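Reader question, answered in our methods column.
A reader sent in the components of a multi-part assembly and asked whether the whole thing could be modeled at once rather than chain by chain. We filled in our standard form and ran it. Here is what they sent:
COMPLEX SIZE: three components
ENTRIES:
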Amino acid sequence: MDYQRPRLKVLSDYYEGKTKNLVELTRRKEEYMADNRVAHDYASYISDFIN
Amino acid sequence: NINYLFNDEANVVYTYDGTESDLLQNVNEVSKYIEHHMDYQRPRLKVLSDYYEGKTKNLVELTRRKEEYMADNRVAHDYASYISDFINGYFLGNPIQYQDDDKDVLEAIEAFNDLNDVESHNRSLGLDLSIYGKAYELMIRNQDDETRLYKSDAMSTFIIYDNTVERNSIAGVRYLRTKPIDKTDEDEVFTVDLFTSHGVYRYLTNRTNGLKLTPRENSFESHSFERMPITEFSNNERRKGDYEKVITLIDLYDNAESDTANYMSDLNDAMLLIKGNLNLDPVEVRKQKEANVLFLEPTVYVDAEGRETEGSVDGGYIYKQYDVQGTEAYKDRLNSDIHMFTNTPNMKDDNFSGTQSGEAMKYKLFGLEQRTKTKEGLFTKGLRRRAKLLETILKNTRSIDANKDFNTVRYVYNRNLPKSLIEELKAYIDSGGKISQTTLMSLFSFFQDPELEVKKIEEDEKESIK
Amino acid sequence: SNNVKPQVFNPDNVMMHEKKDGTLMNEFTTPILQEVMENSKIMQLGKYEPMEGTRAFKLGVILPVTKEFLNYTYSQFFEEMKPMIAEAFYKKFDEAGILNQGNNPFGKSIAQSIEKTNKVIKGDFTQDNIIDLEALLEDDELEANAFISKTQNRSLLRKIVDPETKERIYDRNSDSLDGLPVVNLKSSNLKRGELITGDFDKLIYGIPQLIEYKIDETAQLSTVKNEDGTPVNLFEQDMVALRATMHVALHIADDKAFAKLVPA
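And here is the structure of the entire assembly that came back:
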C-alpha cells in the first residue's frame, strides 16, 4: 500500500488520461482567464497499439 | 466538462454483496443506486451525448460573451460525430456472419436475427459503444409471443453486479422521466423498472420525496428466462468512449476558431489615414471612392514677429493584420492531434497510392485496427449472452430440442474495407472457381434483364445450329 | 461594475467571490459534506395521499449568486446546492407538521393534536413511563407505530432496563425502543427530555407539486436592495439566481392518535 500502489495508480491514471496537468490546479490561474488545461492521451495510444 | 468526465464516482461499476433475494427484499438499496446514478453517472453520459450532437461547450457557455453591438461568433465543429461515425462504421458496417455445425441451431439463430433486424440493431449498439463507452440491450417475450430485442438508452439503464470476482449480473434497472408535452410541473416523476432473474418489478418514484420506490399498477410481471434479461456491452475494459479523451482538444479548436471569427468581425480591414491640421468636408469625403487625386494643403502658421511656417500633413493607407503563421500552425497542431489520438485518418495531410484502395487503407487504419480487435472480443462476449438467453427461452417454450447447445456458434467479423469486384472475380475464377451464368450476370449492371438474357442467348445458340 | 470594494447587499444574502473582509476565494477547493443530508420525517412516517390540485401551501426560496463567484470560485454551485435546498424544505415541512413551529400555515399539526387532546405524560424516562405513554394510545384502540426523539437523549434511554427480563429496553444498535423504530429530529425546538409517539398512518400528506427549479439571469429581486436602496437587477449587475418552489398539503385524520412525554 505505501510504496507499490502509488506507482500503479499513476500509471493507471495516465492510461485513463487523467494526466497531472488536469489535476494539478494548485498553481493554475482562473481569476478572469480560462483554465485551458489539457491532456493528450499518449499513454492510451501507445498501450493500445503495442498490445 | 472536466469535472464531469474525469470525476471518480462517474464511470464506476455497481456491485452488491448480497444475493438477488437480499437485494429484492430491501428495495431501498436500489433507491440508493438510482440516486448515485443520477448524481454522478448521468452527467457524464449527458455531456458525451451533447458532444455527439455538436452542442459543444462553446455554444452553451454564453456566460462570458458580451451582449453589446458586438457579434457572438460562437462555434461548434462536430469532431465527436465525425469520429464516432467513422470508427463505428469501420467496425460494424459489414454484418457479422454466423457459422455453426448444427443447422437446427443455425436456422433458429437466423430466424431470430431476421425477425429482430439484428443487423441494424448491432450497428446501433456499436454507435452507443462509440459515444458512451457502454451499451445495453433488453430482450423480452412480446405479447404476440415472439422473442424481441430492443436497445436500452445508456442514460437511463444500469446494472448491479454480484460482488464476487466473477461479477454475475444481479439486477438491472431502467428509469424514465415520463412527461406530457404541455407542462413542466411533475416531470420529475420517474417510472422505474427493476429486472431480476425471475421477472420485472414496476414502480413509480420522484426525486423530491427522495426516490421512495412504490409499486405501480400490476407491479410484478413474470418472465420465462432464467437470468436477468438486460445485457451490457463495453468499448474497452475502462468503458470509455472514442472521443472522451480529446474533448479538451475539441474545446480548444472551438475557442481558436471563434476567436478568429471575432477578430474578423470586429476590426476594419483597411482605412485611409489622414493626419495634420486640415479642413475635411464630410460631404466631400463621400467622394473618396471615386477621386483620383488627394491634395493636402498644410496650415500656415504666422508668428507675431512675421515668421511663417507650415504644419505637417500626411496621408496613407493602414490595414489590419494578425499572426497567420502562428495561429495556423497552432490550429493545424490541434487538428493533427485530434486525429492522431483517435486513429482517424487526417484528411488534410493525405495522399493515395496507385489504385488498390484496400491495402492503402489497411496501412492507414492499422492503428485503429488494434483497438477494434479488443472491441471485437468484448462484443462477442456480449453476443454469447444474447444467445444464452435465446436458447433458454426456446427450450422453455420447447420450440427447440433440449439437446441443442448454442455455445458452438462461431461469430465471424469482417471489416468494412473498400473492395474491387473485378479483381475479386479475376482472383476467384483463376485458381479454379465456378459461377452459374445467372449468378455471374447478376454481378454486372450493364445487363438490363439478367434473366431474359438467358433465353435470348438460347435463341442465338439455337439458330447457330442451322 | 467597476467597484473595487465589494457591493454591500441588504440582506447580505448574495454569494460573493470577495468577502467583506477582503478575502478572495480564488483556487477555492469544493467543500465536503461533513454531515449527512437530512430527510423529511413526515414523508418517512406519514401516509402519502394521491392528490391532484388541492389543502396545500407553497414553499419557496431564491438563492442569488454573483457571477464572479460562479465563474472563479465554484462553477458547479447550483447543482451542488439543490440537495441542500430540498433539505431546507424537508426541515421546514417537518417542523411545521410536527412541532407547529415556523409559521405553519395549516391549522393542523401533531403539536396541536396533542395539546388539544391533552395526551401528555409528565415524567422522567422510565420503563413504566414508556409503557404509560404507549398505553395512552392503546386506550383509544390505536397502537403506536414509531417514536420521534431528540437524538441527544439516547444517554437516558440506555439507562433503562426491564426489571423482569433484566435487559436493556433500548437497542442502541438498532436504535429501536421497545421494538419500535425511533426517528431523530435535528431541529432545535424539541428539547432533550421530550419524546413523541403515535400511529403515524393517521398523519396524511400530499405533494401537488414536486420541487420545481428555475435558474435565471435577468429577473429583478425586489427583496434584495443595493446599498443605495435600488432593487437588484440580475442582468445589469451581472448576477444569477436560482428559484426553488414546492407545494405540500398536510392532514391529521385522527388527532387523538398522538401522545407526548415531557419532563416534570
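What stands out: The helical segments of chain A are 5-15, 20-23, 42-50. The longest helix of chain A spans residues 5-15.
Send us your own complexes using the same form.
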